[PDB]
Design an enzyme around this catalytic site. Sequence first.
Site, PDB file in Angstrom:
ATOM      1  N   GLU D  35     -11.440  -4.431  -4.362  1.00 60.21           N
ATOM      2  CA  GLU D  35     -11.146  -3.235  -3.594  1.00 60.21           C
ATOM      3  C   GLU D  35     -12.335  -2.929  -2.678  1.00 60.21           C
ATOM      4  OE1 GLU D  35      -8.761  -1.517  -2.910  1.00 60.21           O
ATOM      5  OE2 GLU D  35      -7.260  -1.913  -4.467  1.00 60.21           O
ATOM      6  N   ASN D  46      -5.943   3.498   6.537  1.00 55.43           N
ATOM      7  CA  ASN D  46      -4.627   2.896   6.343  1.00 55.43           C
ATOM      8  C   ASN D  46      -3.593   3.363   7.363  1.00 55.43           C
ATOM      9  OD1 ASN D  46      -5.374   1.518   3.746  1.00 55.43           O
ATOM     10  ND2 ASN D  46      -5.595   3.650   3.063  1.00 55.43           N
ATOM     11  N   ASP D  48      -0.888   4.924   7.047  1.00 51.21           N
ATOM     12  CA  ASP D  48      -0.237   6.221   6.827  1.00 51.21           C
ATOM     13  C   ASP D  48      -1.126   7.400   7.207  1.00 51.21           C
ATOM     14  OD1 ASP D  48      -0.898   7.138   3.358  1.00 51.21           O
ATOM     15  OD2 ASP D  48      -2.130   6.115   4.841  1.00 51.21           O
ATOM     16  N   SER D  50      -4.169   7.812   5.975  1.00 49.15           N
ATOM     17  CA  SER D  50      -5.107   8.055   4.894  1.00 49.15           C
ATOM     18  C   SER D  50      -6.271   7.084   4.970  1.00 49.15           C
ATOM     19  CB  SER D  50      -4.424   7.895   3.530  1.00 49.15           C
ATOM     20  OG  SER D  50      -4.137   6.533   3.257  1.00 49.15           O
ATOM     21  N   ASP D  52      -9.220   5.082   2.133  1.00 51.80           N
ATOM     22  CA  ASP D  52      -9.569   4.781   0.744  1.00 51.80           C
ATOM     23  C   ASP D  52     -11.085   4.959   0.599  1.00 51.80           C
ATOM     24  OD1 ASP D  52      -6.903   4.124   0.272  1.00 51.80           O
ATOM     25  OD2 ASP D  52      -7.201   1.980   0.583  1.00 51.80           O
ATOM     26  N   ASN D  59      -7.423   6.701  -2.701  1.00 53.45           N
ATOM     27  CA  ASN D  59      -6.663   7.128  -1.530  1.00 53.45           C
ATOM     28  C   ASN D  59      -6.685   8.629  -1.213  1.00 53.45           C
ATOM     29  OD1 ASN D  59      -3.805   7.796  -0.162  1.00 53.45           O
ATOM     30  ND2 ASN D  59      -4.505   5.734   0.406  1.00 53.45           N
TER      31      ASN D  59
END
Lengths: 93, 93, 129, 129
Positions: D35, D46, D48, D50, D52, D59
């Site tokens: 990750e 990301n 959408d 958002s 991380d 998220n």
Amino acid sequence: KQAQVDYLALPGDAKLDTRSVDYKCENGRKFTVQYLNKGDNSLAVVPVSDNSTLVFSNVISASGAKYAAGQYIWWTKGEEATLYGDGVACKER
Amino acid sequence: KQAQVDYLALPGDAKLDTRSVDYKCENGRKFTVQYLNKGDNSLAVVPVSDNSTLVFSNVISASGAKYAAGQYIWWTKGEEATLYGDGVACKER
Amino acid sequence: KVFGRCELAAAMKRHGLDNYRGYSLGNWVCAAKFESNFNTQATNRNTDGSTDYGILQINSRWWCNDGRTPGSRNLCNIPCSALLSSDITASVNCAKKIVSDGNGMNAWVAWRNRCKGTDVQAWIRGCRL
Amino acid sequence: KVFGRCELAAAMKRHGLDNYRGYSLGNWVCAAKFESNFNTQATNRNTDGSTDYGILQINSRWWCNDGRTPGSRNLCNIPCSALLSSDITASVNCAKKIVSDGNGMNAWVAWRNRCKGTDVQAWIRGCRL
């Protein structure tokens, strides 16, 4: 010629953000996805194949942007993505 | 007064069928769901609460009509339904 | 035909459902009970325009073709009418593919709401198999 | 701060992640590796809207608030900025809630694509926990 399109009203007064992204996957496929983010709703319109394009809805996950529809899962992480269902690795471009 | 609306374009040229259904759940809640069926796409707009309404996308299952969105699953079977996520048993009316 | 509980369990055992994909026999009899109540002719229409057919209520959008459901995938490549026999073969075979394709028994709404986490072994007890 | 592999495994073991909800220690070190590559300050935007955050890439739409993500649920009720310390406490605690809430480790895209089904134990070997 002609062309008819059906439209769905997205709920709420939140600002809508739309974006089209081109991808290329590890199987040669090349397509474009449309992302729609409006308030609590976040969608991804994905052509899972040449004759089937699905409206995926964002679902809960710990990391990345996970979307679901039919028997598929479209999970993006940055410029990368994975399509699970009949995962395939795709990159933006 | 005023009212602004953002629309999503449903893919394909298949015939669109929409239906509004009123439900009542085991917790006293009462709401109305909008179902949209067009080609490979099937959606359910559900107010999972007083201030949040989500566009669910139909996902694969063995029985009933299972839909997903956010951390919720809206699974219908005939006049019955169940909402999972923070399940609750609901029925038409 | 409405199968009797034990009558159903014996038939399912002959097909090899016991421990099929790690699911003990009781889960399959339990799912039938709450999905159809052992009635091989049960049918139920859904909000997505699909219909569930048979003793295991197989869906017309994803698994079988009833020629009246939009966006049919027919993943079991079978007409839904073939799933209404008093012989549960067709239903068992499609059910095997559904679970074999990793969809798990979680794919059945009745199993999820009435069988998961319960005493499923009870559904084959007193049956003499 | 970029944690060392064994250094990270020892820290996670003190928090009680070994067998936390049935997940052996290697799973947590593995998810972090893929990750964030053990980088506590890693961030990734990301599709959408958002982002991380942290060593475990939590998220901003579902778990933390970064004040710029639409439809934020903030289920860990924590500002995303608090997840960027060289001390993984804030991350481990939100991670425990994510997995504790039935989301399983399947909730992490990296774990799903790089750890699931592998020799996760290898990620804690040679470490002498």
